[PDB]
A paper describes a structure:
The α7 nicotinic acetylcholine receptor (nAChR), a pentameric ligand-gated ion channel, plays important roles in cognition, neuroprotection, and anti-inflammation. Ago-PAMs can both directly activate and allosterically modulate α7 nAChR. Our results from both structural comparisons and functional assays suggest an allosteric mechanism underlying [name] modulation and calcium potentiation of α7 nAChR, involving local conformational changes in the ECD–TMD coupling region and a global structural rearrangement in the transmembrane domain.
In the desensitized-state structure, five GAT molecules are observed within the pentameric TMD, each located in a hydrophobic pocket consisting of residues in helices M2 and M3 of the primary subunit and in the M1 helix of the complementary subunit. Specifically, the brominated aromatic group of GAT inserts vertically in the pocket and is in close proximity to M301 and I302 in (+)-M3 and L243 and I244 in (–)-M1. The polycyclic aromatic group in the middle position of GAT interacts with M276 in (+)-M2, F297, and A298 in (+)-M3, and I239 and P240 in (–)-M1. Moreover, the sulfonamide group of GAT points upwards and makes electrostatic interactions with N236 in (–)-M1. The TMD of the GAT-desensitized structure closely resembles that of the EVP-desensitized state, characterized by tight hydrophobic constraints at the 9’ (L270) position and expansion at the 16’ (L277) site within the channel pore. When the receptor changes from an open state to a desensitized state, the helices in the TMD undergo a clockwise translocation, and almost all of them revert to a resting-like conformation, except for helix M2. This results in a typical desensitized channel pore of α7 nAChR, with the lower half resembling that of apo-α7, and the upper half more similar to that in the open channel. The transition from the open to the desensitized state is coupled with TMD rearrangements, resulting in a contracted channel pore, especially in the lower half of the pore. GAT molecules are located in the intersubunit TMD and maintain the upper half of the pore in a relatively expanded conformation.
Residue numbers in the entry:
A (entry chain A), B (entry chain E), C (entry chain D), D (entry chain C), E (entry chain B): 23 to 348, 431 to 502
Write the structure that this text describes.
């Protein structure tokens, strides 16, 4: 209207969008900086970059944008686009975005007293260190460092307001514990003046329901299935087939864990050593199966069973695991004697083979017990060694 | 021409593209906002972002862009590019695009009465919560929240017009149920004035023909093939080979389901638990096969069959499943006696082995029936537990 | 030079780049629109977006850009960049690009008579419906809809010129049948004036040499190899091994077909049902192998062969498939009688087992013939059911 | 300084950045165009797009940018950014980049005589036809076509200077043979004036060390391992296991070759037919193994060996491949006769089975020789059929 | 304020942002160039491009931006955006970014003496040669070449300041040894004037903990498991099954190494030849297993054991590896003689078969020892042949 047009023409006249809108040129300009977290887009641990949707909030007082409400009836707020009024140069210090700004420049509301208000949105890409030591029971502290690029503490001092949690969309993968912030002053050995900045520490923890059901339970079931080799009879030649097939199945799980894990080489991930232990147990089960088959397929009278081997396997382990089984009339006679002698020799050889097979079965059951104990101990210890494991289980699975 | 050039030179003179084109500066400016959905580009459930091709429609009245048709014959409409006339700052609140605008700024048609008209296109990227609880029988309600960034209800009030469905290209993957909208007013504890906005809720459901034929039918056939282990004779040593190979085949299906599913950890997807049940059934079939082979390859006289084992397997289950099968003249005689005695002992051992093998076959058939029942029950229950399953089947497969 | 500088200074003076360059402000401005297709970048059937390299061609007459050649010797053409002279706002209606323009704005040549000429290049991203019903023997009709955004038929009427095929780089994957176009007028229930637009329908067909050699021939060979199970003797326990391994091999082909196919759920792709039929045949071969092994490994005297089973398998199918094979002196005698009686019983059991094995071989050969017939019929019928299959084969493979 | 500021203020005055800087407006302006290739970023054969880092070099003479060195001491060169002085509109005709320009606009150095100099860098994306007929022994001729967009030969004629090879970073994958160029004139049937352009043909060949060690040697070793089936004895039932496993291993190599090859359907790649031949040989080896096992597991007296079969396998092939192996006293006698008669019958059956097994071994060795010859011939012929194969081997492997 | 506005209005007046701010127009302008490395984003060896987050630091003296502090109380620093004051055109020469600039243009602080200060951030993408000869024990020297685009040494000479390591975020994958820099002058055969530039050589080494635990240890364990074939008895037919399965497992490791390695064909990577040696050892183990099974399954009296074969295997290798095992009354007699003669012949054949089996076992143990030695030697030699292997192990694993 008439009054709004007159006000807009009056305010722009003799206004420099480069000068700091202070009335004395020496007193610092107080700028209240805060943000409003909306959602966490994707925590890319591969490149150690955090992508978030954040609405910044800046509020300062302008001395040259003040008018009288009575003299200009009706109009109470004026908005200026970029390049028309002075704005603070606050931007993310650790921004990993290519543009390095990642802010949509909107208008700046101005009240009758000149109190400007700036709410620039944007999909920020911060760069924070991401440790995967306790993956997937992981808690991350990503930091957003905001501050004026070319203003000191005696010209533009930052004042902090608490972040706005209201309106935050809950990310499925990550749970937001909170976003505490702190205002800090950095000094240089030039001028003895502060360089304040406002930094917000995004504290988030990873949810383990999806990662659990996709990596932990399948691994446990696969290891328990690999333990089945010791129950198959040695007569059927499919023991090492099952062992090598279950190890081949674990290979693709190892590949998946490698593809989802970063290339960080500062610590060993918990799930990495868990999978390593599981695959090592499977390989040792394969070796044990080879030994058991070597015992089972022992040549008749091809060797002598050692006394220690007997007294251990056939007695002590048998009792421990409840085992129980450890003229022409002369020529015809001389000819028929050989058949029965050969049959007796075959029976003795069969008895020796039966002893060897029972020793193999004893080794099978002993290794079944030992590997079950090892698998249970390794799984429980590795899973419960992670901090806040009980909290994550009670909050995800329950 | 002459008249059009004169009109363009007259309208621009003494015009501020920053002022709101109201005649009183206090009466609110009515802006009619609506959109025209064209197609759904891609529903990215991984990042919970919806990509759509939308033509916005804005219509307001400008007081300073009115002329006389008689005084300017021929010209009835004038178009101004960005930065030359005032436009509303309506933009998507929950836009996940990096630019946060995602609108191609076009010209604004102006009638003789000053009624402006704005139709900015753009590939919007909204951020909506996407639940995968009932995947793939899934219905999504994605929300598009539009509103003025820096205008209240007493200066620029939004009026809603129904979305334009005409011209919508049917997306292959998703079926558009509809796009209802609502106008809501948000109040602050500052000024007791409304802050209206227009939000459109895109209601879409996923089609299950592709997902069905790629995930459900192959899984059913794979489970039915895994059930074949109980039909193979135990004489051929290829039972656990088939079982472990079919489980290895299910492993890649699990990997695919993990790759197409988001990392959301708020609920267990229906197809996720379906695949888990199928693979658990396959693993239990492998365990049962191990038990059956242990029964089949039982050493002759290496143990005693328990009385309960006999009375169950060889009688009750046999009847339930229709089983039927549960001087020198003295020396020659003494020598030939041993051969027949050994043959009789071998025959008795063979009879015991036959009893054990029949018990193994009985267990095989019992487990075949039990696992067929379990697979059918699990598949039917999980598939029919999802809401609107019948609608999706009748609309996709028929 | 002097004359060119004078002409440039004269033309710009009193020129508005916003007015339509018509001499009467009521007669429509004729704009001749045409394009010049250069190459097809990538037909992304996943998102139903077509990417092409197109040089647009626009020609209109400007009334205010006319000068005298004699008065300005030497200079015959003047070029103005964007924002200096009026240009039509023609753009792709169904553009799926984020910028929605995808045009590099070049200069506009102007002749002495004011006939402007505009050739803006650009990598357009159109959105066309892509059906995969007859994949890979597929013919696509993608549509490029061009028209003025904010001009009617009484101010800027579009005139169509045929597309320029000369200079088109032949895309390897797709063969360009042609690009016919049509000019259509859309009417609104407001003003009874046309809204013309020029739309070009890109008609292209997919070449099947690469898709053939990568998907069809390997599938045929894999199915023919799966047919080999019926030729292996049942004595060697590696039948179901071969069957399950060939099915596992087909699994990755199914995964590839799923990865290259869109998520469209409006029709079943031809190659999809072809692969489904092949894998179903392989699974049925596995089931048949299980049945054959069940027949082969039949216990001696563990059951009675049914009369119908005999009269079918051992006679009718045997003839159909040319099968041919369907004091102390008393004690010694009484003792030796048992050995020969046991041997006779073993021989009878061996004869019964031989009958069962011959029945298994007969079933093997019958199923070999039946599955060969089924595979041939399914492959030929599915491949030849597609339209223009003969054209694609004669144009790709020959 | 003073003189530089005076010169800059003088040159800009009465200067139009739109006019061609010629002194007569009819004589053509000579522009010397050349480029300086730095590196080849990536040759994307999938989309037939070449990405290169190129520094363009343009030099023309400006008539209005001449000053006196004595009158302006110290200053000898002036630089103007974009939009301040006239520049040629030379750009890549076949640019596949979305922006279609892909040039970073820098300043233009001007000497005292007005000789301008322009060196705009940029990551160009040209579109060249890429044939994969002789992959990986491939030589590509990608073309970069540069020319003025809206200038003829009588206003702006292009003069060519040889490309600058100095400073070219050697790309690891591709070897740069050279970049010859040619200046050509295109005529239209309008005006009988040339339209010159400068095109540079980038001639590059692919290095085969990486592709060799990753695709050729592994394939050769895999085929040689597949040849081992004929050496395994038929007693162990693991022949077809090895054959089908090696074929399954070749399947992933086929998948890799498909993933690295474009979708071009104009010719069959050399490595494609090489892999096809290798996999066909493996499949034929599997079929031969099936035949050999059918011969080996032949039922005793289940058929008659044909006379031709005998005279070939047991004699001619045996000699060719050095094979060598082709009252109560009556009752007891009548009872014991049967045992020896049965043993004699078993011995005759064993002799027949031994003949069949020797025939199977003869077939095994014959097929070993034949398949070794076939594999060697196919590999050598396919590898040496490619042109410049010897050059690529001597330059990569040596 | 008043003084700041007056100063800003005074400085801009009669200022040309194109002239070099020197007081004599002949003396060179000293520009101090330095950078501040923050983090290494990703070292993409595939395209030989290095992505880093770098804050540039430029400092020069401006003659026209000097004012009096006393005359303008309070204001001590003024900031000008892009296009308002002269700035050096320093940019990365070897930038591989599409924009080629990759710098966020910020304000330029100016002191009372005119000493400007420029700190433009940006995510630079340099192009450096990346050799993978010693992967993963790799040390890279990537070079960042900065220099003025269109200024010589007599107008704008570059002065170098050491790079700022403080504030560098430690990248997980790469360890930063240091970033030494050097200032060099390039001369042309035109003018005998220097063209200085400042280049920083980023020296970084790859950490081997992740690559170690994912590629080296699994390969060692897989090779050691492949060595287990020689321990399995030949009676169980699962030797070549284990060998071919472990080779199939190594196939996916080869695929992973190919996917993570660049396409460079100038040298053979260390891990590439390591994996090649491991897979060659596995293949040779498979061949040895085939030979061993051929020896084990030798037909009775189907050939004669060579004298050299005996004296080697059964004696010398047996001792080397501690092996130990290398009227009617006439008719009945004549009938019973045959049974014992046949049994004696069978016993002799069994003895020959036992000799062959012992020879096979001797070959098995000899090959076990030989392949263990070969695997150990190859692994140790290849791993320790890389330079700084001990440093990388002591710094990553310890
Ligand atoms: N999560 S991970 O870091 O990617 C990962 C997962 C599993 C795994 C490793 C790494 C390697 C580190 C330790 C052993 C090695 C491997 C293995 C291979 C063969 C056998 Br027999 C036994 C064990 N197991
Ligand atoms: N769709 S999914 O969420 O990716 C998915 C699919 C299948 C599946 C799971 C997850 C895991 C969760 C439950 C068991 C576990 C796994 C499994 C592994 C070995 C055996 Br023996 C039996 C069962 N089955
Ligand atoms: Ca993530
Ligand atoms: Ca999707
Ligand atoms: Ca495609
Ligand atoms: Ca490539
Ligand atoms: Ca990397």
């Amino acid at each position: 209207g008439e009054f709004q047009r007159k006000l807009y023409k009056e305010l722009v006249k003799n206004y420099n969008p480069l000068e700091r809108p202070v009335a004395n040129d020496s007193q610092p300009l107080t700028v209240y900086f805060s943000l409003s977290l909306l959602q966490i887009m994707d925590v890319d641990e591969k490149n150690q970059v955090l992508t978030t949707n954040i609405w910044l909030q800046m509020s300062w007082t302008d001395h040259y944008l003040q008018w009288n409400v009575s003299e200009y009836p009706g109009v109470k707020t004026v908005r200026f686009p970029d390049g028309q009024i002075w704005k603070p140069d606050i931007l993310l210090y650790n921004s990993a975005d290519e543009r390095f700004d990642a802010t949509f420049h909107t208008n700046v509301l101005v009240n009758s007293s000149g109190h400007c208000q700036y709410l620039p949105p944007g999909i920020f890409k911060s760069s924070c260190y991401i440790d995967v030591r306790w993956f997937p029971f992981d808690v991350q502290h990503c930091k957003l460092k905001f501050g004026s690029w070319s203003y000191g503490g005696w010209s533009l001092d930052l004042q902090m307001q608490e972040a706005d949690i209201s309106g935050y969309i809950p990310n499925g993968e990550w749970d937001l514990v909170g976003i505490p912030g702190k205002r800090s002053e950095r000094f240089y050995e030039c001028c003895k003046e502060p360089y304040p900045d406002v930094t917000f520490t995004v504290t988030m923890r990873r949810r383990t329901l999806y990662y659990g059901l996709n990596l932990l339970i399948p691994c446990v079931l696969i290891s328990a299935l690999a333990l089945l080799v010791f129950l198959l009879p040695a007569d059927s030649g499919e023991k090492i087939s099952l062992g090598i097939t279950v190890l081949l199945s674990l290979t693709v799980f190892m590949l998946l864990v490698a593809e989802i894990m970063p290339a960080t080489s500062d610590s060993v991930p918990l799930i990495a050593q868990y999978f390593a232990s599981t695959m090592i147990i499977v390989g040792l089960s394969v070796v044990v199966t080879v030994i058991v088959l070597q015992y089972h397929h022992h040549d008749p009278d091809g060797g002598k069973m050692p006394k220690w081997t007997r007294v251990i396997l056939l007695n002590w382990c048998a009792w421990f695991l409840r085992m129980k089984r450890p003229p022409d009339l002369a020529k015809i006679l001389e000819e028929v004697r050989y058949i029965a002698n050969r049959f007796r020799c075959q029976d003795e050889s069969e008895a020796v083979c039966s002893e060897w097979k029972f020793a193999a079965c004893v080794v099978d059951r002993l290794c079944l017990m030992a590997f079950s104990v090892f698998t249970i101990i390794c799984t429980i210890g590795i899973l419960m060694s992670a901090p806040n494991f009980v909290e994550a289980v009670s909050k995800d699975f329950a």
